[PDB]
Write a protein that binds this ligand. Sequence first.
Ligand code: HEM
Ligand code: CL
Length: 393
Amino acid sequence: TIPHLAIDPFSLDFFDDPYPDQQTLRDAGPVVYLDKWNVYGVARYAEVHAVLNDPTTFCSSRGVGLSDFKKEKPWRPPSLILEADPPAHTRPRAVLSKVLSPATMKTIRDGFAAAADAKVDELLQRGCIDAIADLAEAYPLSVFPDAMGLKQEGREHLLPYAGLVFNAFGPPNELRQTAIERSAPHQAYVNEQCQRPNLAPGGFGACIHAFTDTGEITPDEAPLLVRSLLSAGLDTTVNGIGAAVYCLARFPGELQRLRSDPTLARNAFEEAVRFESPVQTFFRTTTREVELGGAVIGEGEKVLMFLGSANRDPRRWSDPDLYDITRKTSGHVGFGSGVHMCVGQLVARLEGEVMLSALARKVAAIDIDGPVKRRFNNTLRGLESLPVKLTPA
Ligand code: HEM
Ligand SMILES: [Cl-]
């Protein structure tokens, strides 16, 4: 009843060009079995959305990577938010929601926007830049560590640590095992910065620690919730902003529409998140035998969700393979869906909006002028290098 496929969604061949294989996965059926890793897969929007929105049946506390925490030891202490189910999930989630809330966004927006405008002005003086290192990486590095309240020393560990986290959700392939082999210095740095005395007043980290007396979290939970933001909040935005720049370089008609109405900046970024889905995949584990899209899945089984595929499923989207900055993107799953839906989405959108606004107001053309290089990661999609020439407006 369930078709078996040999596609390896964690192979470099897949990362290099996932879209044909994702159509094969969607068209094979609502539920597939991936013999390569002995997991179920769902690649259509309908089933991905259904799985995300039934956390009781498709739980996260046994890991959202391939590894089943009931069978293997986690490579690090489990996340108190990502790798927790209700009810344990609920109060830590509420704390991070209030830390990364609308009020916090109002406090940081002006500085995030000034930093984006200044970066674009700087890049325009250079003309020919690498939109990854010099923009997608440089801009979040110029705002997010400071907003966290991190000291200056040691920030070179942040991107390696995040790459490690997202590789570690994958299977035990060379990407994962190499990342884990080199991880000790990055974990040591990150875990240390999660302690209250190392987080500057008023930053996201100090705000988490300041929530440890309401009855929602205890002081011993705060370091791991800081760890969540340092795991999830930098590399994702790098790939999201890089995706948006890549899209504007490949779809010049859409750059021209954005220039003509810079208030499209926020939707242009959201559409980039749908179109390139920086977080491509992750898992749930079934807590019982369940029927999904006509197929029966046993208890204790890993289910791989293809978020990027769901965001390109023609059963849900018109012209899914077009980048359209006026698309109604509501319902895309690039930030997830349901109780775990990205708690940092307002930070992500703020960064992407103010960067695309700066581009819309200051740049007339973005032309690829060098070899484009992909960055390979078990669960993130993004570029390693994006050489562009920026023409000033
Ligand atoms: C374009 C940027 C981003 C993308 C594409 C993204 C994507 C996602 C997705 C798909 C999930 C759901 C995971 C699941 O259901 O298992 C998620 C959760 C989460 N994200 Fe993001 N994210 C982004 C930015 C951020 C930022 C900026 C932060 C923090 C400042 C952050 C922190 C978190 C946390 C803590 C969770 C766990 C939430 C929970 O389990 O309740 N993310 N993200
Ligand atoms: Cl760690």
